[PDB]
Amino acid sequence: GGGTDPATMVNNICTFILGPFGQSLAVLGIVAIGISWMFGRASLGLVAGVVGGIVIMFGASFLGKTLT
Amino acid sequence: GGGTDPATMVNNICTFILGPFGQSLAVLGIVAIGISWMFGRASLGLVAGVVGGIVIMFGASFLGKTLT
Amino acid sequence: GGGTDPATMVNNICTFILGPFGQSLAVLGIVAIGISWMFGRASLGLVAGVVGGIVIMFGASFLGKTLT
Amino acid sequence: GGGTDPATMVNNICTFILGPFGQSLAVLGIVAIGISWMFGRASLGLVAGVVGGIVIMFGASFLGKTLT
Amino acid sequence: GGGTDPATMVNNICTFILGPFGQSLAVLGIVAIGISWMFGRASLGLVAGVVGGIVIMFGASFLGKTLT
Amino acid sequence: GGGTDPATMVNNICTFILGPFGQSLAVLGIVAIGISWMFGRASLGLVAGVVGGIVIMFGASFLGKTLT
Amino acid sequence: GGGTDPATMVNNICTFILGPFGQSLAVLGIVAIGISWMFGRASLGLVAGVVGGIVIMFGASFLGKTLT
Amino acid sequence: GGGTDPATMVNNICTFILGPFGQSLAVLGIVAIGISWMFGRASLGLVAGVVGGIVIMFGASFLGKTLT
Amino acid sequence: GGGTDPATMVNNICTFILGPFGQSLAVLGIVAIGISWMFGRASLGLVAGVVGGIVIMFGASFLGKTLT
Amino acid sequence: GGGTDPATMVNNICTFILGPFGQSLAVLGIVAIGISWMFGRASLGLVAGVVGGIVIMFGASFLGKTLT
Amino acid sequence: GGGTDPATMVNNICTFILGPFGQSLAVLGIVAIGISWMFGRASLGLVAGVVGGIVIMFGASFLGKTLT
Amino acid sequence: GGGTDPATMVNNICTFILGPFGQSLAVLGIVAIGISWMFGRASLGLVAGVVGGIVIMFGASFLGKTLT
Amino acid sequence: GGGTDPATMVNNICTFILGPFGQSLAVLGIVAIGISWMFGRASLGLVAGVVGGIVIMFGASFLGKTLT
Amino acid sequence: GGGTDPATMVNNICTFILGPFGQSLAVLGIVAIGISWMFGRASLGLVAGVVGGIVIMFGASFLGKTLT
Amino acid sequence: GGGTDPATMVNNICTFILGPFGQSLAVLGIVAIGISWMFGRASLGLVAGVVGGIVIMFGASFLGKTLT
Ligand SMILES: CCCCCC/C=C\CCCCCCCC(=O)OC[C@H](COP(=O)(O)OC[C@H](O)CO)OC(=O)CCCCCCC/C=C\CCCCCCCC
Ligand SMILES: CCCCCC/C=C\CCCCCCCC(=O)OC[C@H](COP(=O)(O)OC[C@H](O)CO)OC(=O)CCCCCCC/C=C\CCCCCCCC
Ligand SMILES: CCCCCC/C=C\CCCCCCCC(=O)OC[C@H](COP(=O)(O)OC[C@H](O)CO)OC(=O)CCCCCCC/C=C\CCCCCCCC
Ligand SMILES: CCCCCC/C=C\CCCCCCCC(=O)OC[C@H](COP(=O)(O)OC[C@H](O)CO)OC(=O)CCCCCCC/C=C\CCCCCCCC
Ligand SMILES: CCCCCC/C=C\CCCCCCCC(=O)OC[C@H](COP(=O)(O)OC[C@H](O)CO)OC(=O)CCCCCCC/C=C\CCCCCCCC
Ligand SMILES: CCCCCC/C=C\CCCCCCCC(=O)OC[C@H](COP(=O)(O)OC[C@H](O)CO)OC(=O)CCCCCCC/C=C\CCCCCCCC
Ligand SMILES: CCCCCC/C=C\CCCCCCCC(=O)OC[C@H](COP(=O)(O)OC[C@H](O)CO)OC(=O)CCCCCCC/C=C\CCCCCCCC
Ligand SMILES: CCCCCC/C=C\CCCCCCCC(=O)OC[C@H](COP(=O)(O)OC[C@H](O)CO)OC(=O)CCCCCCC/C=C\CCCCCCCC
Ligand SMILES: CCCCCC/C=C\CCCCCCCC(=O)OC[C@H](COP(=O)(O)OC[C@H](O)CO)OC(=O)CCCCCCC/C=C\CCCCCCCC
Ligand SMILES: CCCCCC/C=C\CCCCCCCC(=O)OC[C@H](COP(=O)(O)OC[C@H](O)CO)OC(=O)CCCCCCC/C=C\CCCCCCCC
Ligand SMILES: CCCCCC/C=C\CCCCCCCC(=O)OC[C@H](COP(=O)(O)OC[C@H](O)CO)OC(=O)CCCCCCC/C=C\CCCCCCCC
Ligand SMILES: CCCCCC/C=C\CCCCCCCC(=O)OC[C@H](COP(=O)(O)OC[C@H](O)CO)OC(=O)CCCCCCC/C=C\CCCCCCCC
């Protein structure tokens, strides 16, 4: 009919999230951490969490390859 | 007629989930944990759950063999 | 129907927060740090946190680009 | 008799939800998140969920196209 | 029979919440933050959350338009 | 039946909190700050928080009008 | 026989719930929120929910008229 | 048969909770706040919550009348 | 069956806590404040909190009567 | 035959639950709250719930009479 | 057949929990509070909760008798 | 089947924690307090907490006996 | 035919669960609590639940005898 | 058919978790505590929880034997 | 299918965190402690925590081996 590879679809999701959409998300994540420092009180834990989340999320393909 | 081994079919499901489809799923799992840290607050429990789920899911054949 | 790019929407959020709205937020952040010194006791840590938050929040696009 | 394309009807639902009705829903979603911050306590997770839901819901056509 | 536009109804909800009812809610929000400072201890985070919630809730139409 | 304007009710809450009940609350707030200085150690931050909370809470209508 | 307007009956339910019975319910709602603060810990969210529920429930006729 | 006014029953609940039973509850609430200061550390927020809960709970009839 | 007044039970709790059990608790509270000064550093705030808690807890009946 | 009053049977259930069986249940309820404080962390809400449940359960006859 | 008093069974549970089993539990509760001070930081609240839980749990019969 | 006394098991836990395992824990507790003084700043409160925790934890049987 | 005592079968289940199979289950329960502390955050409640479950499960015969 | 001892399977799980897989888990637990100190602030409680979890998890067989 | 050893995967995580990724993390940890001294006030406790975290995190394999 009009089907496609399930592997292709999940790969499309990986492609979309790690494309320009992910770059815009990364910008908003840095915006959020900036505001949290701004109208709250600065902390090393919060910047570590946000930056670490960005590193983990964009490294998902390579982190998955290392996990095999 | 046109039948096949039920054991072969269940083995095909094991083959498919642990093939490229599982690798793409593993990438999306790391994407999800990255975003959860990103727009939430980082926690060791959540990364342990996601990474442990990936380890369990790809180790299913070997974990099953150990269970005999 | 009436949809649009998800990437465009997240880019619109980046545009809005870093536009005149962010400038007004930056003013209020400097207001808050001024009052904290004013009716409290001055400290280098608090001004560093507020100013650093402003630098991080407006530098989000460029900080994200450096993170790639 | 008086039938029509099932594809047209489902496309009409996509058109209606993403039209002015969706814009009004988007306004009420931002109203709800504003009140939740207002009479509760502000959190980055809740604004991320509401804004992300709006992005996902209006991006449904394009997200579906990427999924093919 | 006696129906009406669903878009009109959702627009009526937007009109009602952002009308005099929202102004009275905004007053009570400032009352709540005043009492929290009053019988608790003052903090910049709590006033930022309450004021930000008011800004978000009344800006819902314009924030939604920017999200398109 | 026996309903009334929701706007009237929220306005009644604004009227009640800012009436004689608020004046009595304001007295107790000054009592609390006096005792905190009394059996603790005097500080400018605590009096600023309590007095600022009273100013914010009674100025809620006018602060809300300025926020429009 | 001995029938009546279904519209009258539903209007009677609206009349009864919004009459003295609703006033007594409103008193018990304020009793419940008082006890929750009393033998628990005070929170702005819980008073907002209870008071908002009272406002919504007595404003049902007018809220319904606005929805048309 | 042996029925009675539902309004009377809800009024009976209001009468019972605000009678001698409520006075005994008020005593236990002051006992609880005293012990919390006693074997913990004193705070203005906790006494405000307990005392405010007592004021709200006994003022339920009058608070409800003001809400109309 | 074998029931009793709920008011009597709550009054029994008031009687028990304010009886010899409360006197023994008062002794342990003074023990705790003595040790805190002993193996820590003396402060007027801590003795005020403990002594104030004892005064509040034993004065609960009379404090409740004043609140009416 | 060998029937009896349904009212007598329901009254027998009221008699049994409020007799020595209820006293033993009351002891176990205080045991449960003691252990919850013991191997958990003490809270005023939990003791209020357990003690309030005992007061409500033994006051059922009198609470029902007040409800008429 | 082989039944027994439900009151006896609930009394047996009261007997068992308050017997040597409860004494051993009391020892472990003091062990837990000792370790919490040991590998954490000492606090009066935690010892009050654990000791109070032991007092409440072993006093359940007498506390229940006072509640009648 | 293969059961045993619940009292014996809880007594076994008391035996194990207060045996050589507790002695090794006591050594590590003194190690921790030594390092806290070492790479921090010495304080009488911290040594009192750690030593008091050891005294409480090993005295659990005798402290429980005194509580009866 | 080939039947047996229903009492024997239920006793066989009691024998099997409390035999070597229960010992292996007890080991896995301690494994689970160790990992929960390990990749989460330690808490006294969770160890109390797991250890208490083991005590209850192996004490089932004796706990049942006490219940008669 | 192709069955095996349920006791053997649960023993296999005990063998697997306490084998090389557990050693690798122990390494990751020490990694996690190191990072928590690293990008957060050092605390004795967190290292006690992680190390205690490792001790409990690998001691599960012997801890279970002591519980009998 | 496409599975692998769960032990290998957990060992891969140990390999990845302790490889070049850990070296880069170690650099950022020293960066963070430098900035904390820089825009705050120097303290021996904070450098001890950060350096100790690095020592613990890279020593995880050897610390785990010592724990056996
Ligand atoms: C593309 C870069 C994205 C990061 C933006 C960096 C730019 C720029 C980052 C730094 C820009 C601001 C510099 C001044 C900030 C400051 O000094 O603020 C004073 C506040 C005072 O607050 P308070 O009174 O409450 O006391 C809290 C403290 O106890 C006492 O000080 O102290 C702090 O908060 C701690 C300092 C945090 C430093 C974070 C650096 C992170 C860099 C890098 C971190 C690397 C994260 C690694 C993540 C893991 C990756 C696997
Ligand atoms: C051949 C082995 C098959 C099993 C695979 C084991 C491999 C490997 C199993 C473990 C591999 C992952 C280790 C890290 C997992 C983790 O730490 O995740 C954090 C999440 C955080 O989530 P959240 O925020 O929602 O809070 C939920 C909790 O309250 C707070 O933590 O915590 C948990 O979920 C609890 C931990 C469950 C541990 C299960 C071990 C089962 C082993 C053995 C179980 C034996 C089962 C016995 C069955 C009965 C037999 C008769
Ligand atoms: C074509 C793409 C279609 C998917 C749309 C993705 C676009 C875009 C997807 C992401 C766009 C929104 C980003 C921000 C969302 C957010 O951060 O919200 C905060 C809320 C806060 O709520 P709360 O307080 O209740 O706490 C709940 C949590 O415990 C604490 O956070 O946290 C969450 O809900 C968890 C985050 C879910 C992330 C889902 C990503 C799925 C992507 C991909 C998933 C792949 C699915 C694979 C399916 C299987 C396939 C075989
Ligand atoms: C229509 C205006 C509505 C706001 C009312 C402003 C009027 C008036 C606002 C200010 C009126 C009071 C001035 C004095 C308050 C004070 O100095 O209190 C001392 C307390 C002492 O407490 P403690 O001992 O616990 O130590 C806590 C601190 O660490 C040490 O000080 O310090 C503080 O709390 C921090 C100061 C907060 C300042 C908030 C200003 C917000 C303005 C504007 C904020 C803009 C919010 C933007 C939201 C986002 C929008 C997108
Ligand atoms: C007829 C009026 C009915 C309401 C009764 C008002 C009377 C009277 C209402 C106020 C009477 C009590 C005043 C003192 C209460 C107090 O200060 O308590 C300290 C506790 C401390 O607890 P903790 O340690 O856990 O920390 C929790 C906080 O983070 C730190 O403080 O702080 C609070 O709980 C927050 C304060 C809530 C204020 C609610 C006002 C609602 C009014 C009006 C609300 C308007 C609701 C609008 C609903 C929506 C309508 C569309
Ligand atoms: C004619 C208007 C009819 C609606 C009545 C609105 C009037 C008035 C509506 C608002 C009047 C009450 C305002 C204060 C309510 C409040 O703040 O309560 C605190 C409780 C605290 O509870 P808790 O502790 O359990 O934590 C739960 C939350 O996680 C933490 O907060 O928080 C909430 O519940 C979330 C807030 C819900 C806001 C709903 C607004 C809906 C409006 C509009 C919705 C639009 C619906 C669109 C439907 C789809 C249409 C296609
Ligand atoms: C019938 C009266 C019932 C109240 C009992 C009053 C009797 C008597 C009330 C007062 C009797 C005790 C007086 C001395 C208490 C004391 O000084 O303790 C020192 C502790 C030290 O602790 P720490 O080291 O942790 O530092 C915490 C602080 O930051 C530093 O000090 O400081 C405090 O806790 C703050 C002081 C709270 C004062 C509360 C008064 C409430 C009155 C009235 C409140 C009105 C409540 C209004 C509710 C809303 C109504 C709508
Ligand atoms: C026959 C009497 C039955 C009750 C047993 C009373 C005996 C005796 C009752 C008291 C015996 C113990 C006294 C010391 C307990 C303690 O101080 O513990 C410290 C813990 C510390 O924990 P954490 O660190 O987590 O911080 C939690 C708090 O925020 C900070 O403290 O603080 C608490 O838990 C709050 C104190 C609760 C007090 C409950 C009294 C109830 C009495 C009476 C209640 C009346 C109930 C009315 C019910 C409704 C009736 C209609
Ligand atoms: C003849 C009277 C019959 C009623 C018995 C009242 C006697 C007496 C009723 C009250 C006697 C007990 C007083 C103390 C109870 C308590 O404070 O418990 C703490 C628990 C803690 O639990 P947790 O940790 O899980 O957190 C759950 C909450 O989120 C945090 O607190 O909090 C609660 O449960 C909420 C309080 C419920 C109050 C119900 C009052 C109903 C009265 C009246 C209700 C009117 C009902 C109207 C029905 C509709 C009629 C049309
Ligand atoms: C059979 C007895 C069982 C109890 C064991 C007592 C033996 C022995 C109990 C005492 C043995 C140790 C004595 C030295 C402890 C110490 O001084 O530690 C310093 C730490 C420093 O920590 P940090 O820096 O974090 O600052 C925290 C403080 O703010 C500053 O100090 O200060 C404390 O923690 C407060 C002191 C608590 C005292 C508790 C006594 C309870 C007795 C009796 C309590 C009675 C409980 C009543 C319960 C309710 C009953 C209804
Ligand atoms: C022959 C005796 C049979 C019973 C075995 C008792 C032996 C022994 C029974 C007790 C043995 C274990 C003691 C320690 C258990 C524990 O403390 O666990 C911590 C968990 C933590 O879990 P979490 O994080 O999810 O938070 C859940 C809670 O909110 C926070 O704590 O807390 C609990 O679960 C509540 C405690 C339940 C206590 C049940 C006692 C029942 C006795 C007697 C009950 C009587 C029953 C009456 C029935 C009605 C009769 C008419
Ligand atoms: C194979 C060994 C695994 C452990 C690694 C040990 C190696 C190495 C462990 C030690 C390596 C680092 C040494 C310097 C650390 C330091 O001094 O940091 C300063 C920070 C400053 O932070 P802040 O400003 O926030 O103030 C927090 C404090 O209040 C003030 O200081 O102080 C601390 O955090 C307390 C010190 C914790 C010491 C933990 C030792 C655990 C050992 C052994 C613990 C035994 C655990 C037993 C578990 C139970 C077993 C049944």
Helix/strand/coil (H/E/C) assignment for every residue in K10-40: HHHHHHHHCCHHHHHHHHHHHHHHHHHHHCC
Q: Among A16, F24, C14, I6, which residue's Cα sits nearest to residue J52?
A: I6
Nearest CA to ligand 6 atom 3: G63
Chain E residue at shortest CA distance from A41: E45
Distance D49 CA to ligand 3 centre (A): 8
H12 touches chain G (CB under 8 A): no
| CB-based contact N36:O53 (threshold 8 Å) | yes
Q: What angle do CA L15, L20, L22 make, to 5 degrees?
A: 75
Write out chain C residues lying below 8 Å of A26, CB-based.
64, 67
Please tell me the distance from the alpha carbon of residue A50 to that of residue K66, in angstroms, as a whole number.
56
Distance O32 CA to ligand 1 centre (A): 7
Question: Ligand 4: does its nearest atom lie under 6 Å from the Cβ of F60?
Answer: no
Tokens standing for residue E4: 């009406």
Sequence-distant (6+) residues with CB within 8 A of K53 are J34, J35, J36, J37, J38, J39, J42, K29
Which of O39, O43, O47, O54 for mutating ligand 1's site (highest number of atoms within 8 Å of CB)?
Answer: O39
The size of chain O, in residues, is 68
The amino acid occupying position C49 is: G
| CB-based contact I54:I22 (threshold 8 Å) | no
Q: Among B33, A16, A58, which residue's Cα sits nearest to residue C67?
A: A58
* Dihedral pair phi/psi, residue E33, rounded to 5°: -65, -35
Q: Among H4, E46, M18, which residue's Cα sits nearest to residue L2?
A: M18
| CB-based contact N64:L16 (threshold 8 Å) | no
Please tell me the distance from the alpha carbon of residue A1 to that of residue O62, in angstroms, as a whole number.
58
| Cβ within 8 Å, pair C9-D60 | no
Kindly report the number of other CB atoms within 10 A of residue J64's CB atom.
Answer: 11
Angle subtended by helix axes H44-58 and G20-38, to nearest 10: 160
Please tell me the distance from the alpha carbon of residue N4 to that of residue N10, in angstroms, as a whole number.
11
L44 touches chain I (CB under 8 A): yes
SS3 state of residue F1: coil
| Cβ within 8 Å, pair B62-O13 | no
- CA distances to J15, J16, L29 from J2, in Å: 21, 21, 73
Calculate the CA G16 to chain-centre distance. Answer: 11
Q: Which residues of O29-46 are buried (b: 16+ CB within 10 A; e: fewer)?
A: beebbeebeeeeeeeeeb
- CA distances to G65, H16, O47 from J21, in Å: 55, 27, 63
Q: Among E53, E24, F6, which residue's Cα sits nearest to residue D30?
A: E53
Distance N56 CA to ligand 2 centre (A): 15
Q: Among B32, D59, D16, D53, which residue's Cα sits nearest to residue C8?
A: D59
Pick from H9, H12, H32: CB nearest J44? H32
Tokens standing for residue E11: 């627009």
- CA distances to A28, B17, B40, E27 from C65, in Å: 12, 35, 21, 42
Tokens standing for residue B7: 């054991």
Tokens standing for residue F49: 């928080």
E40 membership: H or E segment, kind and range: none
- D-A interface (Cβ pairs under 8 Å ≥ 3): yes
- Tell me which DSSP letter residue J40 carries: S
- CA distances to A11, A17, H52, I27 from A66, in Å: 17, 20, 58, 63
Calculate the CA H40 to chain-centre distance. Answer: 24
State the residue for tokens 């249940």: J25
Resolution of the model in angstroms: 3.0
| CB-based contact D37:D5 (threshold 8 Å) | no
Please tell me the distance from the alpha carbon of residue N12 to that of residue B68, in angstroms, as a whole number.
9
Torsion of CA A15, A17, A18, A22, to 10 degrees: 150
Sequence-distant (6+) residues with CB within 8 A of H59 are G30, G34
Please tell me the distance from the alpha carbon of residue C2 to that of residue D55, in angstroms, as a whole number.
13
Q: How far B49 CA lies from chain M's nearest CA (Å)?
A: 9
A6 touches chain B (CB under 8 A): yes
| Cβ within 8 Å, pair J15-I2 | yes
Tokens standing for residue B42: 């980082």
Q: Among C11, D63, D60, which residue's Cα sits nearest to residue A16?
A: D63
Please tell me the distance from the alpha carbon of residue F32 to that of residue E39, in angstroms, as a whole number.
8
- Tell me which DSSP letter residue C39 carries: S
| CB-based contact A18:C37 (threshold 8 Å) | no
| CB-based contact M18:M60 (threshold 8 Å) | yes
SS3 state of residue H41: coil
- Tell me which DSSP letter residue M3 carries: -
- N-D interface (Cβ pairs under 8 Å ≥ 3): no
Tokens standing for residue L53: 């925790």
Torsion K54-K60-K62-K68 (CA) sign: positive
* Dihedral pair phi/psi, residue C21, rounded to 5°: -60, -40
SS3 state of residue O5: coil
The residues lining ligand 12, judged by C-beta closer than 6 Å to any ligand atom, are L 25, 28, 31-32, 35-36, 39-40; N 41-44, 47-48, 51-52, 55; O 45-46, 48-49, 52, 56, 63, 66-67
Question: Ligand 2: does its nearest atom lie under 6 Å from the Cβ of B68?
Answer: no
Instruction: Report the residue of I44, I46, I55, I66 to disrupt the F interface, i.e. the one with the largest count of F CBs within 10 Å.
Output: I44
Write out chain N residues lying below 8 Å of K39, CB-based.
44-45, 48, 52
Kindly report the number of other CB atoms within 10 A of residue I61's CB atom.
Answer: 19
State the residue for tokens 């001004």: C47
Torsion of CA N35, N38, N42, N43, to 10 degrees: 0
- Tell me which DSSP letter residue L42 carries: -
Tokens standing for residue I40: 């820590």
Please tell me the distance from the alpha carbon of residue B50 to that of residue B55, in angstroms, as a whole number.
9
* Dihedral pair phi/psi, residue M12, rounded to 5°: -65, -40
Please tell me the distance from the alpha carbon of residue E30 to that of residue H35, in angstroms, as a whole number.
33
User: For chain D, how big is the Rg over CA atoms in Å?
Assistant: 16
Beta strand ranges found along A1-68 (DSSP E)? none
Distance D52 CA to ligand 3 centre (A): 8
* Dihedral pair phi/psi, residue G60, rounded to 5°: -60, -40
Tokens standing for residue G12: 């009677």
L40 touches chain K (CB under 8 A): no
Q: Among K38, N53, N65, N58, which residue's Cα sits nearest to residue L25?
A: K38
How many Cα neighbours within 13 Å face the side chain of N27?
Answer: 21
